[PDB]
Write a protein that binds this DNA or RNA. Structure first.
Length: 431
DNA sequence: CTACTGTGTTTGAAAATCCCG
DNA sequence: CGGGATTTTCAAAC
RNA sequence: GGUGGGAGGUCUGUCCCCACCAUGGGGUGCGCGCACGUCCAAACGACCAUAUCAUCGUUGCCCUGCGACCGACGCAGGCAUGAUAUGUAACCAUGCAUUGGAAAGUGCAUGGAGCAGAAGAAACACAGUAG
C-alpha cells in the first residue's frame, strides 16, 4: 500500500538552498550585476540599429537583432572592453544556449516586442533591467564531479560552481530521485558508473530576501527511438486502488472531492492582512523609497544635479576647476527602512510559502487517490464571469493549484480534463 | 508608487583555447 | 610545460 | 499557560532560542476548593536605550502659573500615548584576534545541525491586479 513507485522524468530541476560564504555570496551578486549590465547595454545598443549587434538588412531595409551573433566571442569581447565590471560573469552564462542573450533576450524580443523590426520598434515599450526587474539568475554548466553529496547526511550536497572556489553546501538534496538504467542507484553510484550527463545546467538565483538557491536540471538529451539520452527516476506514492474523482471548487474551501473529503484554505493573507497592512503603511512613511516624500526628493536632487552639471560643463568650458563641484548622490534608504522592508518580504514569502506547501500537500493527497481528474477549467477567466469567487480569488490563487495539479497528473500519466462534483465526474466519464 | 499574480516558453555536447602546480 | 577548468562553438532569424 | 517570531531546504507539532501578556473575570455541577468542556480579557515582524519631530485641540491630560470674555479662548511648561533615525533577536561545536587576571561575549573564518507526520519543478518572460 502506498508504494514508492519509480517514474521516468522527462526533465527536473533540483531546487535546493545554497549556503554560501559572505565573500562567495558577494562574488555571486557581482556576477548577477555583470549579467544585468550586459543585458542593459546590448539592448540599449540594438535600438541604434548597430550592425555590430544587429543582424543583416532585408529586401525592405528591415533589421532585427541577431542572437547567434550575440553568442559570438567578438561582441562579448567588445562588452568586456567597454567596461570591466562585466568581465565577471561566466561566458557559459552569456553565450551558451541558456545564456543571457540566447534565452532571456530571445523570449523578451519574441514576445514582449511582438517580433517586429528594431528600427520600427520603440524604446519605451522595452523593459530594461533595474531595481524593479533585476537579473537574479545565471545558468552555467558543470559536470557531475562537482556534485558530491555529503556521505553522512542524506540531504546535504556539495556543489562546485564555475568561477567559484569553495564547493557550495546545498541543503535539501532531493534523494527521492534515483539514477541508473532503472533508477536503482544513488548519486555516487551513477557518477562512478558514468550514467550522468557530462554537462548539467545549474541556475543560481537570489530571492527577494538575501537567499541564494540552485536548480540543477537533470534532463534527458534526445528521444532517439524509445530510449532517452539519459535516464533517472523518482519515487512517488499512489493509493493502492485508485478510483475516478471529480474535483470541485467552493467558496470557503481550497478543493472538494466527489468522495466527500474537503481541504480548507486557511486564508493565509487575511489572517496576516492586519500585520501586512500595518507594515505597508509603515514603510509608506520611512526614510526609504516607496514613500512619495523622498522618491520625489531624490528625483529632484538628480534634477538639479544634471542642471548644475550642464550649467558648469558647457558654459563653464570645464577648464580645470571651475567653481566647486558638489555631487552628493541619489541618497540611500536607511536601515530602519531596510529592516521592515526585509521583514515584510520575509512575511510575504512565508505566506506564499505556506500557500505553496499547503497546495503541494493537498495535490499530493489528491493525485494518488484520483486515477482520472475531472477539473472544470485550467484558466481563471472561465470562472470570473459570475464574480462570486472574486472575493475569495483576491487572497487565494487558483492558478498555482491548477498548475500543480496539471503537472503532477503527468508524472503518473493521469489524464486531465459534492453532488455537483459527482455529476461533473459522470459527465467527464460520458465524454 | 512598490509588491503580488495569471499565462506562455525552456530545460546541452564537444572541442579549442588557457593556465597554476 | 601540461591535464583540467574556463571559453567557445556548434547553428538559421518573421 | 497562551501570542508573535529565528536556524536546522518547505508546512504542523515538538526540540533549542528571542520579545511579550493571564495570574483575572464569568454559564452550571460536586465536595473555601476541584472544574469534567467551551466564554471574554490581554500580548502580534520585537525589545529597550539615545535625540528629534506630531498638531486641525491636536496626542489627551496634568490644568504649573499668566492675560482676557461671560461655561469658553490664547500664552509660557511636563506625562506617556506615535513615529523619524542609530547600538541592538532568535540551535550547537571548532579555529583566529579583541574585550576581561576570570566568567561570558564581541569581530572573522569554518564545521554540524534534528525528532514525530506530510510533501518537495525551478528559472525567465510578459501583462494585469492589490496595497
Amino acid at each position: 500500500s502506498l508504494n514508492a513507485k519509480k517514474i521516468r522524468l522527462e526533465n527536473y530541476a533540483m531546487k535546493m538552498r545554497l549556503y554560501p560564504s559572505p565573500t562567495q555570496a558577494e562574488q555571486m551578486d557581482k556576477m548577477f550585476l555583470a549579467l544585468r549590465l550586459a543585458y542593459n547595454m546590448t539592448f540599449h545598443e540594438v535600438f541604434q540599429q548597430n550592425p555590430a549587434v544587429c543582424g543583416d538588412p532585408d529586401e525592405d531595409g528591415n533589421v532585427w537583432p541577431s542572437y547567434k551573433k550575440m553568442a559570438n566571442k567578438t561582441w562579448r569581447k567588445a562588452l568586456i572592453d567597454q567596461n570591466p565590471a562585466i568581465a565577471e560573469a561566466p561566458a557559459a552564462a552569456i553565450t551558451t544556449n541558456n545564456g543571457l542573450f540566447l534565452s532571456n533576450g530571445q523570449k523578451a524580443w519574441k514576445t514582449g516586442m511582438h517580433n517586429l523590426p528594431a528600427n520600427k520598434a520603440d524604446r519605451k515599450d522595452f523593459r530594461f533591467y533595474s531595481l524593479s526587474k533585476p537579473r537574479r539568475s545565471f545558468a552555467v554548466q558543470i559536470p557531475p564531479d562537482c556534485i558530491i553529496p555529503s556521505d553522512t547526511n542524506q540531504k546535504v550536497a556539495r556543489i562546485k560552481l564555475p568561477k567559484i572556489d569553495g564547493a557550495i553546501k546545498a541543503r535539501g538534496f532531493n534523494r527521492k530521485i534515483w539514477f541508473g538504467p532503472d533508477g536503482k542507484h544513488t548519486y555516487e553510484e551513477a557518477l562512478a558508473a558514468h550514467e550522468l550527463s557530462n554537462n548539467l545546467t545549474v541556475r543560481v538565483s537570489k530571492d527577494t530576501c538575501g537567499d541564494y538557491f540552485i536548480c540543477i536540471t537533470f534532463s534527458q538529451g534526445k528521444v532517439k527511438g524509445d530510449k532517452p539520452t539519459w535516464e533517472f527516476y523518482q519515487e512517488v506514492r499512489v493509493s493502492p486502488i485508485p478510483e475516478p474523482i471529480g474535483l470541485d471548487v467552493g467558496i470557503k474551501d481550497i478543493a472538494i472531492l466527489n468522495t466527500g473529503t474537503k481541504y480548507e484554505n486557511k486564508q493565509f493573507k487575511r489572517d496576516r492582512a492586519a500585520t501586512l497592512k500595518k507594515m505597508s503603511r509603515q514603510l509608506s512613511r520611512r526614510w526609504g523609497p516607496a514613500n512619495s516624500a523622498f522618491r520625489d526628493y531624490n528625483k529632484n536632487i538628480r534634477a538639479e544635479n544634471r542642471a548644475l552639471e550642464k550649467a558648469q560643463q558647457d558654459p563653464g568650458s570645464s577648464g580645470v576647476g571651475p567653481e566647486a563641484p558638489v555631487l552628493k548622490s541619489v541618497a540611500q534608504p536607511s536601515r530602519r527602512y531596510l529592516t521592515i522592508q526585509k521583514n515584510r518580504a520575509k512575511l510575504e514569502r512565508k505566506i506564499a510559502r505556506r500557500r505553496d506547501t499547503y497546495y503541494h500537500q493537498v495535490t499530493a493527497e489528491v493525485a494518488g487517490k484520483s486515477s482520472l481528474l475531472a477539473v472544470e477549467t485550467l484558466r481563471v477567466k472561465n470562472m470570473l464571469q459570475n464574480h462570486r469567487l472574486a472575493f475569495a480569488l483576491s487572497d487565494a490563487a487558483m492558478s498555482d493549484f491548477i498548475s500543480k495539479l496539471k503537472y503532477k497528473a503527468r508524472r503518473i500519466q493521469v489524464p486531465l480534463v459534492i453532488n455537483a462534483a459527482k455529476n461533473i465526474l459522470a459527465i467527464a466519464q460520458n465524454m
